[PDB]
């Protein structure tokens, strides 16, 4: 269908909404899920940035490069990348995009087209899953601070509608349209209205 539920319109200048998680709560995750619904005719553009807290280098990034949807992430070693190279998705029209990660392994589907995935005694116990623990980082989302959407601050801005976007169980968007105490709005971004029915 078309957008659905909580939309946002970004024009102009481009605009920005950012979740902060509490300091005491921010997650650390094996695995995420991410989907959202967008339209625009931009060939180049950053939607949405899961950044870690300052200092540290994870991160998860949803972009258009070419009229192409793609995605780049760092979980602890080197810049992961994947794009689907074969849609060009810039045609002013509605898509879905759905991405998952699950430690070092990764996929990505825009729309209905194929999945593409990308592949002794007490105290010696103890240092050897500190050892593991350590290992484990590698392929964990560290000590994630913001979700900031729009792509301004990246220098990027969004330009066309957004809805249901949905990140590890939390409907950002609506917490955005339900004045969430920890969401910020700036710029020129606006709440789609309800349908009369009609
Ligand atoms: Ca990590």
Redesign the pocket.
């Known amino acids: 269908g078309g957008h659905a539920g909580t939309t946002y319109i970004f024009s102009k200048g481009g605009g920005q909404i950012t979740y902060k998680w509490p300091p005491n709560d921010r997650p650390s995750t094996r695995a995420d899920r991410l989907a959202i619904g967008f339209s625009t005719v931009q060939k180049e553009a950053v939607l949405v940035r899961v950044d870690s807290s300052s200092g540290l280098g994870?991160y998860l990034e949803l972009h258009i490069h070419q009229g192409k949807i793609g995605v780049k992430f760092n979980?602890?070693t080197d810049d992961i990348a994947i794009e689907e190279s074969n849609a060009i998705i810039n045609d002013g029209k509605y898509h879905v995009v759905r991405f998952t990660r699950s430690g070092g392994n990764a996929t990505l589907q825009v729309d209905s087209w194929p999945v593409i995935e990308r592949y002794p005694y007490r105290l010696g116990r103890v240092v050897d899953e500190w050892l593991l623990d350590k290992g484990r980082?590698?392929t964990?989302?560290?000590s994630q601070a913001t979700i900031i959407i729009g792509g301004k601050e990246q220098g990027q801005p969004f330009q066309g509608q957004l809805s249901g976007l949905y990140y590890n169980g939390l409907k950002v968007l609506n917490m955005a349209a339900e004045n969430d105490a920890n969401i910020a709005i700036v710029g020129n971004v606006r709440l789609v209205g309800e349908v009369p029915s009609s």
Do not use: M, P, R, T
């Open positions: 994870d979980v602890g980082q590698l964990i989302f560290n």
